[PDB]
Design a protein around this ligand. Structure first.
Ligand code: NA
Length: 89
């Protein structure tokens, strides 16, 4: 599922990221702090960050994506890919 999340600021945003071009992996949210701005914003552990403030995250180094997020104006605009689930009942 593709989605666009706007996170109210300013930093600290209250989430964690993994990955980047130097690890040859995508930028992914791994944790959202229970008391924090990302919790309000509808951001979920496991969301892949496709774009940061309209700029593609594809070729960003870990530290590069980290820095762009921390330096970001409010709101932080993330383009996301989210893994949906289906349960049998
Ligand atoms: Na910021």
């Amino acid at each position: 599922m593709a989605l666009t999340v706007d996170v109210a600021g300013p930093a600290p945003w209250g989430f964690r990221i993994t990955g980047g071009r130097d690890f040859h992996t995508p930028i992914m949210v791994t944790k959202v702090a229970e008391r924090g701005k990302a919790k309000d914003a509808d951001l979920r552990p496991g969301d892949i960050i496709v774009a940061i403030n309209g700029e593609s995250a594809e070729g960003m180094l870990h530290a590069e994506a980290q820095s762009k997020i921390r330096q970001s104006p409010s709101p932080l605009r993330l383009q996301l890919d989210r893994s949906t689930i289906e349960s049998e009942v």
